[PDB]
Curated annotation (Swiss-Prot):
Gene name as annotated: BACE1
High-level lineage: Eukaryota, Metazoa, Chordata, Craniata, Vertebrata
Processing after translation: N-Glycosylated. Addition of a bisecting N-acetylglucosamine by MGAT3 blocks lysosomal targeting, further degradation and is required for maintaining stability under stress conditions. Acetylated in the endoplasmic reticulum at Lys-68, Lys-206, Lys-210, Lys-216, Lys-230, Lys-231 and Lys-238. Acetylation by NAT8 and NAT8B is transient and deacetylation probably occurs in the Golgi. Acetylation regulates the maturation, the transport to the plasma membrane, the stability and the expression of the protein.
Portion of the full-length sequence here: 59 to 446 of 501
Protein name: Beta-secretase 1
Enzyme active site: D35, D220
Coiled-coil positions: none
Length: 377
């Protein structure tokens, strides 16, 4: 019954994927960012230079004020607002209506993005990281509690405008090929997983696998980049530099500051390596790997000059809060957030990344010893 939800996501490259939602009675329509890296449902509720519309509580007869304030800090952006509840629907989703907590955003700093076409954010992670505390029930928990929608969703994010699907309540098997491979959700707060091995062009990075998950690894549709802990980032960039040393790149390209360009249609894909992330599996001593192409971590950006060249930003960057498996990792895969069984599944997406000689993949089974040692404590 999921066909109604296929292709219910839109966005601009690097500016997030959003789904259409209605809040209030009568329904007010808003585009809402889909974010598995946070747990608050919040909407613009006051004018802002980057908002074309916003939630007007006064016009909703079903609005209820919770008389508590709230703030959520993200990596760089932040907002504060007033908590309340209201009726919410998803037009291209399940045919249900829920009373959900809504943070009405009244003030913000570097949160809304100019031209992103979304006006709010839907945090799909667990209550443990909700603000102000874990008693503010997240949207998806409300949806499951108040309806019969099964306790899972899946995200199919497609690359180069962007689109995709959020299948709410199940798995749509026409959106992927091959088998689904599942990794345990290590803890219900972020969607935390355990990376047990990293390979670049087939060569093991040969680090203590604890380094990969220091201090955690998460699956985050609300972040563009693959973000890596400092030691892992340095090892990965060194190795990526070595593979592509045929060409010289500005020192600021590797830091995400300067873009690189080539004559349109001459991007030298073959000099950049594939990256394989091995994830903890479902059975003892078993893992699986997902393989990432340079077409995923070299993100296309608009040509800032007058050239008709292809230009790219390096979409692997350094982190101090653990690994983030962001949108560039998720693009091309069908990712199943199986909350009911505490696991996350990966499969090759119908919109998977295409090279002539290489292909993004999800492969298993593999044997990996002492996977338990890879978690950080
Ligand atoms: C590389 O660093 C900078 C950076 C880049 C991007 C997103 C974030 C940060 C970000 O903050 N994402 C947020 C995501 O909840 C994270 C935040 O830090 C962690 C959670 O803490 C609560 C991990 N989950 C969600 C978010 C917020 C504001 C704007 C966004 C997304 O716009 C989406 C388009 C841009 C995506 N790219």
């Amino acid at each position: 019954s999921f066909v109604e939800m296929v292709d219910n996501l839109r966005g601009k490259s690097g500016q997030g994927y959003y789904v259409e939602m209605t809040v209030g009675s009568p329904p007010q329509t808003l585009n809402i960012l889909v974010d598995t890296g946070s747990s608050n449902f919040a909407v613009g509720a006051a004018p802002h230079p980057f908002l074309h519309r916003y939630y007007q509580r006064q016009l909703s007869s079903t609005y209820r004020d919770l008389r508590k304030g709230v703030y959520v800090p993200y990596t760089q952006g932040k907002w504060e607002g007033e908590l309340g509840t209201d009726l919410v629907s998803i037009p291209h989703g399940p045919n249900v209506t829920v009373r959900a907590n809504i943070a009405a955003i009244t003030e913000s700093d570097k949160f809304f993005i100019n031209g992103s076409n979304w006006e709010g954010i839907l945090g799909l992670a667990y209550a443990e990281i909700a603000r102000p505390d874990d008693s503010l029930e997240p949207f998806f928990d409300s949806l499951v509690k108040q309806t019969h929608v099964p306790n899972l969703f899946s995200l199919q994010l497609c690359g180069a405008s962007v689109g995709g699907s959020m299948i709410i309540g199940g798995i749509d098997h026409s959106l992927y090929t091959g088998s689904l491979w599942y990794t345990p959700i290590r803890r219900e707060w972020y969607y935390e997983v355990i990376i047990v091995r990293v390979e670049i062009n087939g060569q093991d990075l040969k680090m203590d696998c604890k380094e990969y998950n220091y201090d955690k690894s998460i699956v985050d549709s609300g972040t563009t980049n693959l973000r890596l802990p400092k030691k892992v980032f340095e090892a990965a960039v060194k190795s990526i530099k070595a593979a592509s040393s045929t060409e010289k790149f500005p020192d600021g390209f590797w830091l995400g500051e300067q873009l690189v360009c080539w004559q349109a249609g001459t991007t030298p894909w073959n000099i950049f390596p594939v990256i394989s992330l091995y994830l903890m599996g479902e059975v003892t001593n078993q893992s699986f790997r997902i393989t990432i192409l340079p077409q995923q971590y070299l993100r296309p950006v608009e040509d800032v000059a007058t050239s008709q060249d292809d230009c790219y930003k390096f979409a692997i960057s350094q982190s101090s809060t653990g690994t983030v498996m962001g949108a560039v990792i998720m693009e091309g895969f069908y990712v199943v957030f199986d909350r009911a069984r505490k696991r996350i599944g990966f499969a090759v997406s119908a919109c998977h990344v295409h090279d002539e000689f290489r292909t993004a993949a999800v492969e298993g089974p593999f044997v990996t010893l002492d996977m338990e040692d890879c978690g950080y404590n």
